[PDB]
Amino acid sequence: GPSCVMDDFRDPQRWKECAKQGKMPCYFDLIEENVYLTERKQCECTPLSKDERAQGEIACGEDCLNRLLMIECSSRCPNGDYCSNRRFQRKQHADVEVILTEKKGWGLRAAKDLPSNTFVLEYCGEVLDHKEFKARVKEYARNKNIHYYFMALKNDEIIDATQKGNCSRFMNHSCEPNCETQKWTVNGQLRVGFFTTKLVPSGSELTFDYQAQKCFCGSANCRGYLG
């Protein structure tokens, strides 16, 4: 299968030409952060010393109060630049490639070994209210779309990556997945990202459990249909 790197999506003209010859997926509008279709209405970690930073100690690691609350730190974190709990904000994504699968369309694969319980990518898109979601559901069905790109975020917010999003929109479903979603608060706004739940070796497809298309995940426990 052909593959491509995330940076290949930054050049719209080369992409559209790659897409014409099947070497990249269909064009979509690449975004860095969620766009609201309709606009809506500090931890206790001790600052690491310069010595500790040099020693390789982690700032705002597993014991960070904000991290436990699933809240990212701000620029005002006691650890400032060294804070490791600003992953969404700093786009500290995993090394992933977009690949053409045998029967699912395009997907995502690990380009390096990915440790367990690490951030992969944020699921970005157009954030829809209930009314917008209703309309998009109807439109996509009218247009006979094969692939769907919806992800519930919170009450009255559903992310739609069909038209605008990032490479997260390519992560396929598996009944025995190696990633999960987590909803994180950044500056009082909720976002959602993919995180590994296992060590994913280099070359392996990244998958999550979506929640009537037959399922081609290939798992021994396959539930047979996407759900």
Ligand X SMILES: Nc1ncnc2c1ncn2[C@@H]1O[C@H](C[C@@H](N)CC[C@H](N)C(=O)O)[C@@H](O)[C@H]1O
Measured from the CB of residue 121, what is the shortest distance to Zn ion in angstroms? 21
Q: Which stretch binds Zn ion (CB under 5 A): 46-54, 71-79, 100-108, 123-131?
A: 71-79
| 31: exposed, middle or buried (Cβ count in 10 Å: 0-12, 13-18, 19+) | middle
Q: 18: annotated binding-site residue?
A: no
Q: 182: annotated binding-site residue?
A: no
Helix (H, G, I), strand (E, B), or coil: what is residue 54? helix
* Residues 12-71 close enough to bind ligand X by CB under 6 A: 25
For 28, phi then psi, to 5°, come to -145, 170
Q: Which of 6, 24, 64, 121 binds Zn ion (CB under 5 A)?
A: 64
Tell me how far CA of residue 43 lies from CA of 63, 78, 145, 150, in angstroms.
Answer: 10, 8, 45, 33
Closer residue to Zn ion (CB): 146 or 220:
220
Q: 4: annotated binding-site residue?
A: no
Q: 73: annotated binding-site residue?
A: yes
By CB under 5 A, the count of residues binding Zn ion is 13
Q: Which of 83, 110, 192, 200 binds Zn ion (CB under 5 A)?
A: 83
Work out whether 124 is an interface residue with ligand X (CB under 6 A).
no
Chain centroid to CA 128: 17
Work out whether 177 is an interface residue with ligand X (CB under 6 A).
no
Q: List strand residue ranges (DSSP E) for 2-91, in order.
A: 3-5, 29-30, 35-36
Work out whether 119 is an interface residue with ligand X (CB under 6 A).
no
Measured from the CB of residue 161, what is the shortest distance to ligand X in angstroms? 7
Q: Which of 65, 78, 185, 216 binds ligand X (CB under 6 A)?
A: 216
Measured from the CB of residue 59, what is the shortest distance to Zn ion in angstroms? 6
Q: 83: annotated binding-site residue?
A: yes
Residue with tokens 């990518």: 121
Query: Of Zn ion, ligand X, none, which one sits near residue 183, judging by CB under 5 to 8 A according to partner kind?
Result: none
CA distance 172 to 74: 32
CA distance 149 to 42: 34
Q: Are 61 and 52 a contacting pair, CB within 8 Å? A: no
Closer residue to ligand X (CB): 94 or 226:
226
Q: Which of 120, 161, 171, 175 binds Zn ion (CB under 5 A)?
A: 175
Tell me how far CA of residue 174 lies from CA of 76, 139, 215, 216, 224, in angstroms.
Answer: 39, 27, 8, 8, 10
Residues that bind Zn ion (CB under 5 A): 43, 45, 60, 64, 73, 77, 79, 83, 85, 175, 215, 217, 222
